[PDB]
Symmetry: none
């Protein structure tokens, strides 16, 4: 299981989404190296202009590539993979329900996701496209969910807003393996991300670079 | 126009408001002194109990009474006596919105503010319709910048409304002012307000004291 990540691994991410009746599809190609814990990805909105701003999609688009010094549920579940479901509540605004399957298809790692968006405001921060094009790092506390034989998590993302205010997204997360199963003691995952664009790509896109680690306490 | 404000000026304010299909009327009588920049006003809800808490109406219910070196920047006294139109859109965070239009001009010796207010999307059992806001108003600086296209003042600012449980209700104001007849560099207006009641008034009312200085 852990053996799979001892080198650069190719990554494919597919997102099929419906938000407030807006359908969009996002496809991503990239590499991930677990040893350094590095993600490099490029995302394309195949459907045309994204109905939602890119930073909101960042959390839902492979924590299996985290770098552990001296418990890795995500890598252990491989290659059968794990299922990740989230309910993301946007403060004073709509909500995301997502389900994803993260697993190996051949030599590459595939993330297949379905996202449904409800109750969003026309001319809210989300549908108004009022969020700043960046993502700010926070530690994520992970707990063992014995009932699902999986990890549970709760955290809030702070999205910067063009006017200078902040849009809060409250995340509830569950991950469970697909085959026959090892739950890790409490730990933090720290993800740091940079968002940029390719100058030669005419399509609506996001270039994402990530460093993912883990800690105790 | 500045000439009119050299003495105490009588003030009449009329508000026509519809919030969530609740219709109400507010009439205000008072005096204003531009020299000290002081407003004294009393407001009565003729229609009966107000559907919304009084502090939400404070912003909507005359900046021409601002108080010096920046006198050239005084857009409001300028447009006078023909007057100016003030339009606002106030969004209450996690809650409804006010869209307002007003005309501020001189009718005879008195200064008149006549306003139309429409309120939409408010929650029953929200701070606004629930009447959960504290009866006070807290000073805020307001950043004012010119607007060449409109020949007028635009401004944006946020009000913090105290909430009985100890939370805060945020109201973000977007403002545009345009003259009616035939501009100021960036500056802010600071207003301090006191809300009180006349003990002898059985009607729903607000007694308002204000100082504006720029």
């Amino acid at each position: 299981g852990e053996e799979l990540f001892t080198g650069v691994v190719p990554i494919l991410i597919e997102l099929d989404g419906d938000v407030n009746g807006h359908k969009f599809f996002v496809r991503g190609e990239g590499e991930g190296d677990a040893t350094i814990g590095k993600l490099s990805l490029k995302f394309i909105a195949t459907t045309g202009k994204l109905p939602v701003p890119w930073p909101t999609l960042v959390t839902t688009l492979v924590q299996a590539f985290s770098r552990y010094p001296d418990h890795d549920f995500f890598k252990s579940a491989m290659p059968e993979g794990y299922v990740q479901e989230r309910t993301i509540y946007f403060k004073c605004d709509g909500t995301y329900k997502t389900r994803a399957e993260v697993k190996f298809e051949g030599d590459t790692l595939v993330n297949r996701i379905e996202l449904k968006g409800i109750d969003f405001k026309e001319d809210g921060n989300i549908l108004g496209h009022k969020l700043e094009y960046n993502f700010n790092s926070h530690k994520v506390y992970i707990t063992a969910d014995k009932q699902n034989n999986g990890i549970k998590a709760n955290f809030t993302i702070r999205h910067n807003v063009e006017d200078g205010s902040v849009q809060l997204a409250d995340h509830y997360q569950q991950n469970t393996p697909i085959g026959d199963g090892d739950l890790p003691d409490d730990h933090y995952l720290s993800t740091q991300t940079i968002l940029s664009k390719d100058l030669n790509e005419k399509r609506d896109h996001m270039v994402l670079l990530e460093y993912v680690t883990a800690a105790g306490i």
